[PDB]
Amino acid sequence: SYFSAADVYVPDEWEVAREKITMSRELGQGSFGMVYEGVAKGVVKDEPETRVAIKTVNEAASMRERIEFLNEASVMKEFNCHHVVRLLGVVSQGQPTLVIMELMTRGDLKSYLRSLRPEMENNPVLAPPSLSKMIQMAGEIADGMAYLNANKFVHRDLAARNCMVAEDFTVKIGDFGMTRAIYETDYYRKGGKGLLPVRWMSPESLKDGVFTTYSDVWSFGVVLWEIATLAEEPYQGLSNEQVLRFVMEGGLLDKPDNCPDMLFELMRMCWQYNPKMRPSFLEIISSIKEEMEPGFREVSFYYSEENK
Numbered sequence: 001s002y003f004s005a006a007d008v009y010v011p012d013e014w015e016v017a018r019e020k021i022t023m024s025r026e027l028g029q030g031s032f033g034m035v036y037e038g039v040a041k042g043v044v045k046d047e048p049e050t051r052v053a054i055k056t057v058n059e060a061a062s063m064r065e066r067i068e069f070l071n072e073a074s075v076m077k078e079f080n081c082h083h084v085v086r087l088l089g090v091v092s093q094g095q096p097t098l099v100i101m102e103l104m105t106r107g108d109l110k111s112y113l114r115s116l117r118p119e120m121e122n123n124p125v126l127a128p129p130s131l132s133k134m135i136q137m138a139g140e141i142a143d144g145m146a147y148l149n150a151n152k153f154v155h156r157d158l159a160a161r162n163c164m165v166a167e168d169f170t171v172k173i174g175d176f177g178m179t180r181a182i183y184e185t186d187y188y189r190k191g192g193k194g195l196l197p198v199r200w201m202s203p204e205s206l207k208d209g210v211f212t213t214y215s216d217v218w219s220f221g222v223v224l225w226e227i228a229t230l231a232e233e234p235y236q237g238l239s240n241e242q243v244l245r246f247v248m249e250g251g252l253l254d255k256p257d258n259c260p261d262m263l264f265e266l267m268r269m270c271w272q273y274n275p276k277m278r279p280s281f282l283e284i285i286s287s288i289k290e291e292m293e294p295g296f297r298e299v300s301f302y303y304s305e306e307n308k
């Protein structure tokens with residue numbers, strides 16, 4: 001009279017010995033538990049030791065919660081791309097439960113962009129990012145997204161808060177779902193389907209709640225706008241409800257102050273009302289590849305043999 005509904009986590013080849021992991025600096029609190037920086041032995045080829053981020057579930061959490069955490073985190077096991085944050089191992093044996101991730105020392109891109117805003121202290125400050133630096137970020141994000149699309153995924157929440165920034169300033173698609181609870185006001189719940197990033201969503205997505213790679217491209221345009229405004233709220237001064245109506249009826253974000261023409265042109269291609277007229281992520285990269293740093297050819301999905 002029924003199918004069993006019991007969820008489990010099955011230890012696999014990603015399991016790492018607890019003795020190989022040490023945790024130091026606290027990075028923050030996730031929905032599941034605390035996240036730390038640390039060091040992991042033997043998790044990267046040719047590296048005796050690697051700096052890592054360690055997501056934890058402590059001894060007080062329920063086993064149901066524990067298993068949910070492990071199965072959610074495990075989605076990242078399928079990916080191996082320079083521009084997607086890597087999962088490096090799992091400690092499911094004993095407690096606390098650990099998931100070991102590539103460390104992104106400069107944080108999420110929204111936080112990073114906001115950190116570049118001048119302080120209200122009249123001190124000397126780095127000028128806003130150059131076109132060349134913004135283009136580099138764009139290409140890296142687009143490469144990670146092309147990789148995900150090639151692996152038949154739709155992201156559904158592409159936004160600066162869901163990209164991460166490495167020590168060397170490389171931007172990558174972030175660990176899935178790790179910042180939505182922190183930037184809670186970037187979401188709006190209107191019904192079933194729950195909390196949706198309405199200010200990042202395409203007109204067609206706002207209309208019927210379906211997401212495609214075409215709507216990921218729309219969101220990519222909004223990310224470029226975020227980069228150019230240092231992460232202002234899109235459609236600031238419109239309520240959540242007013243955004244739905246504005247975008248569905250054809251309204252667009254304005255060209256940011258001092259935004260280079262090239263970048264806004266790219267935004268406009270992403271924001272074509274008809275999804276079929278938007279470029280693909282591969283086509284986006286093709287258009288800016290001459291402006292990418294030379295090493296992009298060695299590490300990108302775009303130039304890899306997997307891009308066929």
Ligand SMILES: Cc1nn(C2CCN(CC(=O)N(C)C)CC2)c(C)c1Nc1ncc(Cl)c(-c2cnn3ccccc23)n1
Binds near residue numbers: 055164
């Ligand atoms: C995303 C991020 N944030 N940070 C820090 C945060 C503290 N400061 C912010 C600031 O401005 N300070 C003045 C302190 C520097 C940046 C660092 C190193 C990271 N890297 C990183 N890499 C990989 C992962 Cl999987 C995670 C991560 C996942 N879930 N999760 C939940 C909470 C926190 C992190 C994470 N995080």
